[PDB]
Amino acid sequence: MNLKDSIGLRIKTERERQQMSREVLCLDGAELTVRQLIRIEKGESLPSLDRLSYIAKRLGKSMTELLDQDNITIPDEYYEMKNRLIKFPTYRNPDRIKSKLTLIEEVYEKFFDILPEEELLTLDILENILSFTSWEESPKVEEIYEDLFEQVKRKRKFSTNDLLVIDYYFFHLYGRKQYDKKLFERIIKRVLNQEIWTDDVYNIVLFNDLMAIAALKIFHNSFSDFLTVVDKALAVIEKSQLYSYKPSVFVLKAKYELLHKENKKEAAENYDKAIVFASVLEDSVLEESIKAGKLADGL
């Protein structure tokens, strides 16, 4: 018996004492789904502060009562390590990808017993995306993702964790000819409406979501709001000083000019801005990769 078992049993015992069904407790599932509540009551998942507060309100209990002497405090070292690994750029370098995956597993194992389901899923998302693991081969992660995405897709203000769930949604769309276009537009619009503050962790995750959006729009040949995506990516770069990512945004503007405007001159000029920027950064690997892209696009 661990922390998850003790809290889950307490919640289940009180829910059953009140003769309350899971469906009644969870209402429309916006804050807690039935499967999420089942996993909590079985001791498979720990409730986050937010889920625990919701459950206590529905049961007419205080969080203190539901906790008794149990302590769900997440050590600050967890967030320190999670933030460090989100700010750890791979640059598509396989050695750095492997190091980042090692960091993810380190934090996952060290804090497993004290993390709520949402945090563990966040780590599983990063591992699967970075290792290019098919979501179809990860069925337990997928079941948990499904309900978190049903909750995120109803929101208009996204936390860092929400943006990572959204990143895993974009991962489902990679290379997929068939997709729900109305859902994608809805998600796109809300991501573009997030405010950019001084949270570098948030901004990096937001930036990567914008790049995923841009890449899917090119793939689907759907360029509505594409310049909005470009402008928001540039604003994130400025707020968090993410200058090594700026050439990739100039390359996005080139694709827009080349594929949507069919303006080869302005596409070439945007490629040249990316190349000069990479060169001034003295990032030769990036510079040559962009020069190859310019030539491969016939410019």
Residue numbers in the entry: 1 to 299
Sentences copied from the publication:
Here, we elucidate the structure-function relationship of the transcription factor ComR, a new member of the RNPP family, which positively controls competence for natural DNA transformation in streptococci. XIP-binding induces release of the sequestered HTH domain and ComR dimerization to allow DNA binding.
The crystal structure of the apo form of ComR from S. thermophilus has been determined at a resolution of 1.95 Å in the space group C 2 2 2 with 1 molecule per asymmetric unit. Assembly analysis of the crystal contacts using PDBePISA suggested that apo ComR is a monomer. Size Exclusion Chromatography combined to Multi Angle Laser Light Scattering (SEC-MALLS) analysis clearly established that apo ComR is a monomer in solution, with a measured molecular weight of 41 kDa for a calculated value of 36.5 kDa. In the absence of peptide, the HTH domain is sequestered by the TPR domain of the ComR monomer, generating a new interface of 874.9 Å2. In the apo form of the protein, they form salt bridges with TPR-2 residues: R35 with E146 and D147, R39 with E117, and R51 with E118. The residue pair E117-E118, which belongs to the strongly conserved L115PEEE119 motif located in loop α7-α8 between TPR-1 and TPR-2, thus plays an important role in stabilizing the inactive apo form of the protein. Superimposition of the apo and bound forms of the ComR TPR domain (rmsd of 2.4 Å over 212 aligned Cα atoms) showed that the main difference concerns helix α9, which was broken in the dimeric complex and forms a more canonical TPR-2 motif in the apo structure. However, the small overall interface (537.9 Å2) and the poor calculated solvation free energy gain (ΔiG of -1.9 kcal.mol-1) characterizing this contact in the apo structure suggest that the monomer-dimer equilibrium is shifted toward the monomeric form in the absence of peptide and that the dimer would not be stable in the absence of crystal packing forces.
